[PDB]
Design a protein around this nucleic acid. Structure first.
Ligand SMILES: [Mg+2]
Ligand SMILES: [Mg+2]
Lengths: 138, 181
DNA sequence: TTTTTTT
């Protein structure tokens, strides 16, 4: 149950946001919503805020990053926030993977599927994945 | 047309490790499928020469697995450079997919994409930036369809690139058959 | 139908 949580992140100067859902996409906890300079708070202090947050919310090594094309976020975080990424699993929940499958296999449904703030990007991604679960999964 | 744009470029790599700063690609395979996972074309399946020093320095997992599979020896014997490998894979996908439109596909293929973005950038210019990560569907199956997840394929025949692709396609087909509407 | 591993 705790091992099936998801760590949703989005990055957009860089703005970073994070929140936790359970396996059924219900939001359990809101994390930091912070601004850093591209390599207002230092990268190291930001990384600590996000690491402390996920330490309070997920078991070590077990939970994946989640978001739209979150592999791009993961490339950045693997390089610049490696201690945060050490807390997470290496697999991801890439909502855009489900988007590409929906477009191919469920074109009718795809036509109805779901700001530039990071927290809004997370909210949209969760809503999009919930739409896929409701409309194209068994 | 739209069908061609809905093809998928399935790739799997073997590397000397997971450190993007120092590790190198040693094996690569590529298959093209249509949108319904039928294999349309089998691309190059190449073992890429890398320095002896790098292979002797590999992690314990890599030394064990790449030794027992025969990969380390084949790497030492290979005459295929990274640049020539990239030439052959780009020639292949140019023949098979429209530029910029088709995604990489495979299990946790974001890791392969990190390595290809670094070491085969011209190949990656032909591809979309989105991926079809079968392990995303795996993680959703584990959560939402735990009974079905018991019966999903998980392990390839070998830690070799072409066998990994084959298993990844079969795993995605299993999910389509068992957990999609 | 499977065989807790991105390399
Ligand atoms: Mg694989
Ligand atoms: Mg393998």
């Amino acid at each position: 149950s705790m091992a099936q949580r998801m760590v949703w992140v989005d990055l957009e100067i860089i703005e970073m946001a994070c929140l936790i859902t359970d396996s059924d996409l219900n939001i359990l906890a809101e994390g930091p919503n912070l601004i850093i300079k591209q390599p207002t708070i230092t990268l190291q202090q930001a990384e600590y805020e996000f690491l402390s947050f996920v330490r309070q919310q997920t078991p070590p090594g077990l939970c994946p990053l989640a978001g739209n094309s979150v592999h791009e976020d993961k490339k950045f975080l693997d390089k610049y926030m490696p201690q945060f990424m050490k807390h997470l699993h290496y697999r991801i929940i890439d909502v855009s993977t489900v988007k590409e499958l929906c477009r191919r296999w469920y074109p009718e449904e795809y036509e109805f599927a779901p700001s530039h703030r990071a927290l809004d990007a997370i909210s949209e991604s969760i809503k999009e994945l919930q739409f896929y679960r409701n409309n194209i999964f068994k | 047309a739209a069908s061609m744009a809905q093809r998928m470029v399935w790739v799997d790599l073997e590397m000397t490790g997971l450190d993007i700063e120092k590790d190198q690609i040693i094996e690569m395979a590529c298959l093209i499928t249509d949108s319904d996972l039928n294999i349309l074309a089998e691309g190059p399946n190449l073992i890429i020469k890398q320095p002896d020093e790098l292979l002797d320095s590999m992690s314990d997992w890599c030394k064990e697995h790449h030794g027992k599979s025969g990969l380390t020896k084949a790497v030492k014997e290979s005459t295929i450079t990274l640049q020539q490998a990239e030439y052959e894979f780009l020639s292949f996908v140019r023949q098979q997919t429209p530029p910029g439109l088709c995604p990489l596909a495979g299990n946790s293929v974001h890791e392969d994409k990190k390595f290809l973005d670094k070491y085969m950038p011209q190949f990656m210019k032909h591809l979309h930036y989105r991926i079809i990560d079968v392990s995303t569907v795996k993680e959703l199956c584990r959560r939402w369809y735990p009974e079905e997840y018991e019966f999903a394929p998980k392990k390839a025949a070998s830690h070799r690139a072409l066998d990994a692709i084959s298993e990844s396609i079969k795993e995605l087909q299993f999910y389509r058959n068992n957990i999609f509407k």
